[PDB]
Design a protein around this nucleic acid. Structure first.
Ligand SMILES: Nc1ncnc2c1ncn2[C@@H]1O[C@H](COP(=O)(O)OP(=O)(O)OP(=O)(O)O)[C@@H](O)[C@H]1O
Ligand SMILES: Nc1ncnc2c1ncn2[C@@H]1O[C@H](COP(=O)(O)OP(=O)(O)OP(=O)(O)O)[C@@H](O)[C@H]1O
Lengths: 600, 600
DNA sequence: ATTTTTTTTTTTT
């Protein structure tokens, strides 16, 4: 038998490789992960002797795997197999694809969208797509069309799901688009996923065993005997398949860029005190966090220092059950044209993950829970696809918040205050939990803030827009030769490529590492100075009381909760519980600066 | 089989000899109870089965079907051996350990199972079969195989009608049936594992277990997992078309909107000795919504919308009205968020819907047969027999949705015209809404119909109100940041589970009717106000200005079980109207103050 | 080819 080539493969496999397996034993889930480098450590570089006969001979590796299981566990014929190979070097691309790549073990990734649910599927092997329940006989001569139906009860089965996936974004060519590609996967991988991840799957492409075809007008024929003294056709299409997963890029025991292996509450959740606490409280670090992060960027430099906590966690305290509290906050930017709203807006996308750059002016209302479905695609109703909430505690910042229609209203008032999700179809009445905040991409009418009308009428749009969005922090243009020439003399070396930005002294990487250490305190606030934030807001209120004849505003307690989230996440930035009264002064200061953007 | 020797003996050893609870075990009397009830649904608990023989758990689920048949036959052999009397005119039940949705799996087929779900829209009721009679074509003598036969063929040329009739005939007579209606499944929005795939699966019931289900309502089942008889078997596409079917043995309520306490009986007296007097406008009201400070107006307000619906047909005119109706105009910034939670748990009927983007257009009748994909859906109005539609952001809905709602308030019903079928839908229901205004967030004592723009023939049907203009009051805000911390410092009268006894009894017993007690006062509120409250904002007096008062002043007194009335509690409710009505009129408003402070 | 649906455009005071 030729497939005793695969017998030798698994002979090879088992002997020298002879605990997660012991973990598998209760439901007999059969899944074990192994490196593919094993083929080089031990199979003596049989990668091309192994890779191609994957679904050829995997049955036989499966057999040997079960036969391994028998070598210590009392094994029975019930046993089945999965295999979960991994650590694939020289990862191939989506274009790495032909007829010729049958049976391979190529590695690929993407995202997870537009998915389908669990609907599962003689001790011989009748499990095929190329299957027939009616068969001829066993011992005697019986008919060739007749059939019994039998023990589907003392037997061995599986379970699976189905999806679609579009092409990756580290790979993005001209012209072409991220087309959709379709897979079923086995059970212990099932429903362990969600939209928005990165992978190194097994891409073992196989074909459709079709039932009928449309526009499949290639050879039309059949394995029909010759002549002497309705039929079927054949035209297929491609798919893919898999065996193994690793969701990547989204990690705190990881010791990151700026580390050495040290001790903590966990392994290296915050182990790097000895190096990072240099940059904990020494407010030169603040100046660095104003300056050593945007060396290529220059405008108003408050935005360079007010935004920063936005990336990082808020409150999430030990609180009531009656209603939700929030940690993170509504955000905006405005200014005028040619004040360079593109410098940072991509590095908004880049500086941290789940940092989704996508435009708003193109959207519909179906950029939240897509729409619905009314054919039996999966169960005639799968309407939990979306566009916004894919962030597992992540940001979805959008561009051009102006020409959009009046639908985002009901999306966003609830989004950053109520965090709920539903549609008006024949789905259900159910709702789920918003993870995300946003910032703006506004712009004025012609851009120019002619100080002759109210800001609300200088934009002239919906009403609560500027009450929910607690911080705007505008960048506005004037005509002063000094300010432009700071910029130009930064261009002096932005293309004189040697040190072609502002002098940096605090890397993005060490900074992004300290980010998570900020999130491991739970500051708890009964501060006397914090209790006097009532006095601060009242003293504020005399100033909200100001600008009330001319240009009264719509002020509320969202701003209050914002103020306290600000000081809270700042104490989280202090690397300290027991919030500091200095936060009172700072909060009051900048936020009573917020009024400067609206004076007329 | 052999072992069934023992089983029947072991059954008969307990159904009338094994006893707990100080003798006369129910089973000895349950049989005759159901027998005299013509009911035929003997019930068991696995607990007592386990108390008898815990060996009854593992020779069972090799085939749980044999357990039930082996039990049904003990039944028959116990029924007519003792009651041969009523033998000319069975199935059983079990009802105790929970398993969860999406935990039944590949492995949980056709065994001892205990499982849950929820209802939605589905089909009607229909019959099925049990018995084999087909023959009469040659000789067609009486042959009579000896079983009612489910899926059984022999097909000889020899069969006792002169062992003939290889060809075939069919009967349409002497033919057993058994009614049956199909389900649709749903899963709870309380027990959510965060937005996973929405539950709906093929599940089944039977003849006696029939004609009881209702949409978006729940019933716990014993249940046992199987699959459709043939899920798309042919050499075919890249997947089998498989679903999987569950079938009902005992159906056990999950809702219990009726009496809920089975064999609480200790605390039941505190309701009618503390929610019965006219002080209960403070006792039952102190606990009205003690969550946050502001607006004790709404506490008194919402307490009485929950309360009624009634015939009390006046003289020979028609049915007049039996409904509640509320609406408010606020601003997000108001503490209006929690708009539907608790008294809908008090509500025996109601069903939720948030606002447009997710408002119901269903709020369309044909009649079909059922081939694959035959369904239709629309308005919940049969549901909500004295129930409520729980909503925020109402102002965007469709005029024709409002048509039904206006008709519900007008003729207690809706009126289809010019359709195929002209079926109806009776409206004994209640409504809640939370919209936003025009031109902003609230418009002052200037008119209210245009403060938020609903239309002419629609709002006149609506009843309750509460409106918040809100300027500053400081001590409560400092109290509220104290509330912020101490409410975020959950570091970790009428009894609470019995207040519903008040909706049971208060509305139930006392339903007073009266002559004109002083109601020519309302002739003044007609005529004087037609001359006093003339032109400021001052139309709104109608029959529903008092018919609504019957709706709710009666509720206010029905709280008390007065049974006979002077103007006291009536006008105490109109103390809402002195408060509710004033809100809609120009700052020349105190025409109400003058004209009612005696009615205050 | 029809039945049960939904949006994305087609073109706007
Ligand atoms: N203070 C500054 N710091 C850095 N770059 C600046 C500054 N002021 C102006 N610029 C430059 O001006 C250019 C402005 O055009 P950019 O592509 O950002 O336009 P934009 O902001 O998208 O325009 P609009 O917002 O009107 O669509 C930027 O490339 C930026 O490099
Ligand atoms: N009198 C008050 N008492 C308590 N909290 C208040 C009061 N006034 C304002 N607040 C605060 O103001 C916030 C207002 O925004 P909120 O989340 O209520 O929007 P919303 O009312 O839910 O919007 P919508 O009701 O349209 O969904 C609340 O979180 C609440 O804590």
């Amino acid at each position: 038998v030729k497939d005793e080539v695969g017998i030798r493969a698994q002979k090879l496999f088992q002997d020298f490789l002879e605990r997660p397996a012991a973990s598998l034993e209760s439901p007999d889930r059969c899944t074990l992960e192994v490196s593919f480098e094993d083929v080089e450590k031990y199979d003596q570089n049989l990668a091309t002797a192994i890779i191609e006969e994957y679904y050829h001979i995997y049955p036989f590796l499966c057999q040997s795997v079960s036969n391994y299981v028998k070598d210590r566990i009392g094994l029975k014929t019930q046993k089945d197999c999965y295999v979960a190979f991994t650590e694939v070097p020289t990862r191939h691309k989506v274009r790495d694809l032909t007829t010729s790549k049958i049976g391979t073990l190529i590695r690929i990734s993407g995202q997870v969208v537009r998915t389908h649910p669990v609907h599962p599927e003689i001790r011989n092997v009748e499990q095929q797509f190329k299957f027939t329940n009616p068969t001829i006989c066993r011992n005697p001569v019986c008919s060739n069309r007749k059939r019994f139906m039998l023990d589907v009860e003392k037997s061995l089965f599986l379970d699976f799901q189905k999806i679609r996936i579009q092409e990756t974004q580290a790979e993005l060519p001209r012209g072409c688009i991220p087309r959709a590609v379709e897979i079923i996967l086995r059970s212990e991988l099932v429903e362990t996923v969600q939209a928005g991840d990165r992978y190194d799957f097994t891409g073992t492409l196989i074909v459709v065993p079709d039932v009928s075809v449309l526009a499949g007008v290639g050879t039309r024929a059949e394995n029909s005997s010759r002549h002497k003294p309705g039929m079927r056709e054949l035209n297929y299409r491609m798919a893919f398949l898999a065996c193994s997963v690793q969701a990547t890029t989204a990690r705190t025991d990881l010791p990151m860029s700026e580390v050495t292996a040290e001790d903590m509450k966990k392994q290296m959740t915050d182990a790097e005190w000895h190096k990072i606490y240099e940059m904990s409280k020494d407010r030169n670090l603040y100046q660095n966090l104003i300056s050593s992060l945007f060396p290529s960027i220059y405008g108003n430099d408050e935005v360079k220092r007010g935004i920063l906590l936005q990336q990082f966690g808020g409150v999430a305290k030990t609180t009531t059950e009656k209603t939700s509290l929030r940690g993170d906050i509504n955000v905006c930017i405005v200014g005028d044209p040619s004040t360079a709203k593109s410098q940072f807006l991509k590095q908004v996308s880049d500086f941290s993950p789940r940092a989704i750059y996508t435009s708003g002016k193109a959207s519909s209302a179906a950029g939240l829970t897509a729409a619905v479905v009314r054919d039996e695609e999966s169960f005639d109703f799968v309407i939990e696809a979306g566009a916004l909430m894919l962030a597992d505690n992540g940001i979805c910042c959008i561009d051009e918040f102006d020409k959009m229609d009046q639908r985002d209203q009901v999306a966003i008032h609830e989004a950053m205050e109520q965090q709920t999700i539903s549609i008006a179809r024949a789905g259900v009445r159910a709702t789920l939990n918003a993870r995300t905040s946003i910032l703006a991409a506004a712009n004025p009418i012609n851009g120019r803030y002619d100080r002759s009308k109210s800001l609300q009428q200088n934009i002239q749009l919906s009403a609560p827009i500027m009450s929910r969005f607690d911080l705007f922090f505008i960048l506005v243009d004037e005509c002063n030769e000094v300010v432009d020439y700071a910029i130009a003399r930064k261009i002096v070396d932005l293309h004189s490529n040697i040190e072609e930005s502002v002098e940096r002294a605090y890397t993005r990487e060490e900074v992004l590492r300290y980010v998570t250490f900020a999130r491991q305190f739970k500051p708890v606030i009964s501060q006397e100075a914090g209790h006097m934030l009532v006095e601060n807001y009242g003293h504020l209120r005399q100033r909200d009381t100001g600008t009330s004849g001319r240009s009264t505003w719509r002020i509320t307690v969202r701003q209050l909760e914002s103020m306290i989230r600000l000081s809270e996440a700042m104490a989280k930035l202090e690397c300290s519980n027991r919030v500091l009264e200095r936060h009172v002064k700072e909060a009051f200061r900048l936020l009573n600066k917020s009024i400067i953007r609206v004076e007329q | 089989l052999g072992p069934r020797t023992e089983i029947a003996n072991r059954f008969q050893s307990f159904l009338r000899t094994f006893v707990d609870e100080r003798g006369a075990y129910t089973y000895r009397d349950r049989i005759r109870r159901m027998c005299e009830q013509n009911m035929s649904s003997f019930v068991v608990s696995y607990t007592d089965l386990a108390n008898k023989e815990h060996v009854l758990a593992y020779f069972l689920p090799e085939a749980p079907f044999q357990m039930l048949e082996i039990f049904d036959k003990v039944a028959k052999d116990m029924v007519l051996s003792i009651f041969p009397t009523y033998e000319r005119v069975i199935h059983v039940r079990i009802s105790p350990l929970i398993e969860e949705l999406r935990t039944f799996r590949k492995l949980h087929l056709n065994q001892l199972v205990r499982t849950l779900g929820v209802v939605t829209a589905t089909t009607g009721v229909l019959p099925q079969l049990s018995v084999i009679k087909y023959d009469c074509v040659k000789c067609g003598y009486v042959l009579g195989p000896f079983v009612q036969s489910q899926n059984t063929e022999i097909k000889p040329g020899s069969c006792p009608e002169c062992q003939s009739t290889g060809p075939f005939s069919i009967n349409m007579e002497q033919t057993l049936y058994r009614n049956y209606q199909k389900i649709t499944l749903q899963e709870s929005p309380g027990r959510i594992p965060a937005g996973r795939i929405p539950r709906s699966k093929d599940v089944i019931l039977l003849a006696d277990l029939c004609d009881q289900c209702k949409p978006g309502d729940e019933l716990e089942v014993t249940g046992i997992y199987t699959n459709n008889y043939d899920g798309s078997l042919n050499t075919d596409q890249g997947f089998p078309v498989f679903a999987t079917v569950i079938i009902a043995n005992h159906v056990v309520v999950k809702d219990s909107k009726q009496v809920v306490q089975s064999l609480t009986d200790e605390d039941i007296a505190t309701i009618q000795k503390l929610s019965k007097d006219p002080r209960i406008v403070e006792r039952v009201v102190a606990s009205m919504a003690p969550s946050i400070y502001g607006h004790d107006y709404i506490k008194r307000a919402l307490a009485l919308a929950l309360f009624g619906g009634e015939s009390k047909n006046p003289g020979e005119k028609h049915k007049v009205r039996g409904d509640i109706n509320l609406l408010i105009c606020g601003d997000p910034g108001t503490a209006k968020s929690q708009f539907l939670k608790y008294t809908e748990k008090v509500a025996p009927r109601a069903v939720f819907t948030t606002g447009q983007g997710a408002s119901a257009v269903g709020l369309y009748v044909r009649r079909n047969p059922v081939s694959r994909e035959w369904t239709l859906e629309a308005g919940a109005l049969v549901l909500a027999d004295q129930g409520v539609c729980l909503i925020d952001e109402f102002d965007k809905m469709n005029d024709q949705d409002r048509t039904s709602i206006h008709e519900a308030m007008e003729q207690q019903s809706i009126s289809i015209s010019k359709a195929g079928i002209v079926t109806s839908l009776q409206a004994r229901c209640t409504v809640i809404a939370a919209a936003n205004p025009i031109g902003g967030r609230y418009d002052p004592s200037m008119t209210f119909s245009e403060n938020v723009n609903l239309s002419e023939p629609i709002l006149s049907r609506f009843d309750v109100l509460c409106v918040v203009k809100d300027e500053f009051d400081p001590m409560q805000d400092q109290q509220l940041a104290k509330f912020v911390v101490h409410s975020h410092m959950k570091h970790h009268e009428i009894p609470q589970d019995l207040l519903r006894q008040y909706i049971v009894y208060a509305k139930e017993n006392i339903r007073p009717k009266l002559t004109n007690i002083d109601e020519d006062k309302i002739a003044k509120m007609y005529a004087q106000l037609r001359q006093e409250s003339f032109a400021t904002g001052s139309l709104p007096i109608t029959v529903r200005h008092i018919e609504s008062v019957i709706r709710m002043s009666e509720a206010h007194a029905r709280m008390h079980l007065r049974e006979n009335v002077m103007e006291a509690d009536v006008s105490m409710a109109i103390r809402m109207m002195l408060e509710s009505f004033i809100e809609a009129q120009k700052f020349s408003v105190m025409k109400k103050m003058r004209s009612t402070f005696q009615k205050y």
